[PDB]
Design goal:
Radius of gyration of chain A: 28 Å
GO biological process, one term (chain A): signal transduction
Number of strands of chain A: 0
Protein name (chain A): NAD(+) hydrolase SARM1
Number of helices of chain A: 31
Enzyme class (chain A): hydrolase
Largest interface: A-B, 53 and 56 residues
EC number (chain A): 3.2.2.6, 3.2.2.-
Oligomer: part of a larger assembly
Keywords (chain A): Cell projection, Cytoplasm, Differentiation, Hydrolase, Immunity, Innate immunity, Mitochondrion, NAD, Neurogenesis, Phosphoprotein, Repeat, Synapse, Transit peptide
Chain lengths: 480, 312
């Protein structure tokens, strides 16, 4: 456990002293091959070699070997360049990236232009893959310079190991880039270069990481139009329907900082991003449930998002993956709600409260006898006085859940002229006011004679922007 | 003097590695803990990010005031005077004003990629870099750049929550003065050897504006709708089309349909020798006479240019 470090430290001390001593061509590459072979032997220990490899990379950093690699990447030869590059590919851990981001940027960026041999490119793609995981500043310095161009040119190749590093580099750049980095990637059409990486029938991990990069680019609202025009979203949904997370749980762990990146994939109301997030959180929930670290999903809060995915599902694949992810954890799976909300009695409202996280007020609704018709017509004052929900923040969380409910609702028992589809064609956040306008006796043939006070007092539209938009639309297109 | 809280603000609000490293080293040489950089996706925050933000900016006493109320980032971006005063136990207006100063500093440094459709935060920053704090005020009301010419002052006061009338007048004036204004190429391929080549052809043709389709109800109508035709000849592409008189292969159906149309067939040869006409059906022998284009992996751009020069 600790004696492997005692075996591997003085050997790397002698090897780095030999690398400092040698200044030729073949001896330097032989020393780099010896260091790289010792690092490869350090990778392959069962549940031991992780901390051992981290300690050996820290010892290489403290011996000044990182600056030695930065000087050997400036060497005018070709062989010792690819051995130093393949060694620097495996040395890069969570503590070396700061020292490489301070100094080493510009040297690796220079090798990003030299693209013709495969032995350079397969490792420089992995070095850029590691360097996109540092911060947003390093992502800006790589994308604004010729670092993104290297990956977008190397997506053309057929190397099954290089394209994995390219897909992971684009995914980690989309995760840790920001706004302008994603704008510069999609204006340079980085989502279109992921089409051979999401369709290649030789590797499936490569297609999964390509679909991850496509989904993370598709979680930005100013980006989704050109991603839908690219056509790489349509390969996401069958592929996730074709694979199994229990097989890919061994190849795919990550820390909690990367576990925080998979949660807004589910709360970004896109089908492909929710499928990718459900598949990855199911596989990594199998990972964290094999061990005893299931508190991380409750700390970050993906469990309530998976419950929302189960209770608000229109797709069988993401619902099955969310049910499997909640089954691999230590809580019960919820049931899909009945969409006919005006047809709800009391027990459906109680089940809805038990599923969305309002259990404490369950006995607050049973004594008051609230069904779906009273749930669709509930205001501030009845929550505050009659229901014992005195906190306005708790009331606002209840109105957010009521927005999520009245978006996903079947109004077939009350809507005469299909008003919900018109409200959705205006803006998909307007359908929550459908019950506001159907219960007042309105249809498509009357909205040209409705004022603002009738939308405020009777229909209950509290936002004046939405009132102005509904009045303008009802006077411009429903006047005939 | 109070430089420690400023160094904590420098760590928690950093976009530069140098000043953040110097502030972390300065807080490490002192006798307190260094903070972590916050996650910029504030509408993607759950409760623990809000708790960490409170522990970093100096609002520890109200941490248990936000955990019982279950405040996430979406409730943090939408918090007012009355909910601070009544629900959260922050009775002092000076403490509320310090919280709104920290909320100004937070909503300046925020990632709105999960909600902003038309890039409103950059417009608000181009007006004045203290306006981006109202970005969540205007995105959550359903507004974008194409609607702000029909917004009044009451909609900015009540709905958007802009309390300063100077900022309301500037936003209204700016919004009224500057914001007032069938496929073509079908690709046939073998689904076991010519998938990556067909995908790469589709990408390099959609880079030049060509509407390219990929993958008897839909495929024959896709051949009928496409103006051109590109055949991928992988090693083993015409293997299942040999002695296929019973019309079983999909590539057989696509080649027979394309020769029944009369479209511009451009074959793409990637290490595949030319087959014989007698092992193929007669109606698909005419593909053996078209001028094909070889594929070069090192010179792909000139090959795609040669493909574009042989199309409509």
């Amino acid at each position: 456990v600790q004696d492997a470090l005692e075996r591997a430290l003085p050997e790397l001390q002698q090897a780095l002293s030999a690398l400092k001593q040698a200044g030729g061509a073949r001896a330097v590459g032989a020393g780099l091959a010896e260091v790289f072979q010792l690092v490869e032997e350090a990778w392959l220990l069962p549940a031991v070699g992780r901390e051992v490899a981290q300690g050996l990379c820290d010892a290489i950093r403290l011996d000044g070997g990182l600056d030695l690699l930065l000087r050997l990447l400036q060497a005018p030869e070709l062989e010792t360049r690819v051995q130093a590059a393949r060694l620097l590919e495996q040395i890069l851990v969570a503590e070396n990236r700061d020292r490489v981001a301070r100094i080493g940027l510009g040297v690796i960026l220079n090798l990003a232009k030299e693209r013709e041999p495969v032995e350079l490119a397969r490792s420089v793609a992995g070095i850029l893959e590691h360097m996109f995981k540092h911060s947003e500043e390093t992502c800006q310095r790589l994308v604004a310079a010729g670092g993104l161009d290297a990956v977008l040119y190397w997506c053309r190749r057929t190397d099954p190991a290089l394209l994995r590093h390219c897909a992971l580099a684009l995914g980690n750049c989309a995760l840790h880039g920001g706004q302008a980095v994603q704008r510069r990637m999609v204006e340079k059409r980085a989502a279109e270069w992921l089409f051979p990486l999401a369709f290649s029938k030789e590797d499936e991990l490569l297609r999964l990481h390509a679909c991850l990069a496509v989904a993370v680019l598709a979680t930005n609202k100013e980006v989704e139009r050109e991603v839908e025009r690219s056509g790489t979203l349509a390969l996401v949904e069958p592929l996730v329907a074709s694979l199994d997370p229990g097989r890919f749980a061994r190849c795919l762990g990550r820390g909690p900082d990367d576990l925080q990146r998979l949660v807004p994939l589910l709360d970004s109301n896109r089908l492909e991003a929710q499928c990718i997030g459900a598949f990855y959180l199911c596989a990594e929930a199998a990972i964290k449930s094999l061990q005893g670290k299931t508190k991380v999903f409750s700390d970050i809060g993906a469990i309530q998002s998976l419950k929302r995915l189960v209770s608000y599902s229109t797709n069988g694949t993401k619902s099955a993956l969310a049910k499997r992810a909640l089954r691999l954890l230590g809580e019960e799976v919820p049931r899909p709600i009945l969409p006919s909300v005006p047809s709800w009695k009391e027990a459906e409202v109680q089940t809805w409260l038990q599923q969305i996280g309002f259990s404490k007020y369950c006995e607050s609704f049973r004594e008051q006898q609230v069904d779906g018709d009273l749930l669709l017509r509930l205001t501030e004052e009845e929550l505050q006085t009659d229901l014992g929900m005195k906190s306005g923040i708790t009331r606002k969380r209840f109105f957010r859940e009521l927005t999520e409910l009245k978006t996903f609702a079947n109004y077939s028992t009350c809507d005469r002229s299909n008003l919900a589809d018109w409200l959705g064609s205006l803006d998909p956040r307007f359908r929550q006011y459908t019950y506001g306008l159907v219960s007042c006796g309105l249809d498509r043939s009357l909205l040209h004679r409705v004022s603002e006070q009738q939308l405020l007092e009777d229909c209950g539209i509290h936002l004046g922007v939405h009132r102005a938009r509904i009045l303008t639309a009802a006077r411009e297109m429903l006047h005939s | 003097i109070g430089a420690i809280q400023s160094l904590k603000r420098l760590v928690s609000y950093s976009t530069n590695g140098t000043k953040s490293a110097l502030a972390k080293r300065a807080l490490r040489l002192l006798g307190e803990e260094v903070p972590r950089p916050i996650l910029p996706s504030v509408p993607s925050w759950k409760e623990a990010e809000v708790q960490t933000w409170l522990q970093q900016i100096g609002f520890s006493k109200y941490c248990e005031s936000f955990r019982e109320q279950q405040v996430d980032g979406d409730l943090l971006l939408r918090l007012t005077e009355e909910e601070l005063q009544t629900d959260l136990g922050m009775k002092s207006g000076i403490t509320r004003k310090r919280f709104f100063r920290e909320l100004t500093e937070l909503k300046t440094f925020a990632n709105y990629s999960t909600c902003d459709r038309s890039n409103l935060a950059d417009w608000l920053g181009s007006l004045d870099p203290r306006f981006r704090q109202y970005t969540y005020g205007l995105v959550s009301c359903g507004l974008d750049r194409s609607l702000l010419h029909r917004v009044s002052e009451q909609q900015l006061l009540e709905d958007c929550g802009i309390h300063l009338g100077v900022h309301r007048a500037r936003i209204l004036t700016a919004a009224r003065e500057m914001l007032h204004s069938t496929p073509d190429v079908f690709i046939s391929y073998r689904r076991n050897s010519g998938s990556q080549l067909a995908s790469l052809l589709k990408v390099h043709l959609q880079l030049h504006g060509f509407s390219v389709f990929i993958d008897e109800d839909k495929l024959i109508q896709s051949v009928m709708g496409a103006r051109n035709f590109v055949l991928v000849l992988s090693p083993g592409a015409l293997d299942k089309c040999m002695q296929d008189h019973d019309c079983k292969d999909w590539v057989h159906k696509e080649i027979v349909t394309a020769l029944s149309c009369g479209k511009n067939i451009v074959p793409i040869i990637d290490g595949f020798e030319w087959p014989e006409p007698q092992v193929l059906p007669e109606d698909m022998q005419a593909v053996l006479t078209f001028n094909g284009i070889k594929w070069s992996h090192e010179y792909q751009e000139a090959t795609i240019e040669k493909i574009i020069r042989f199309l409509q």
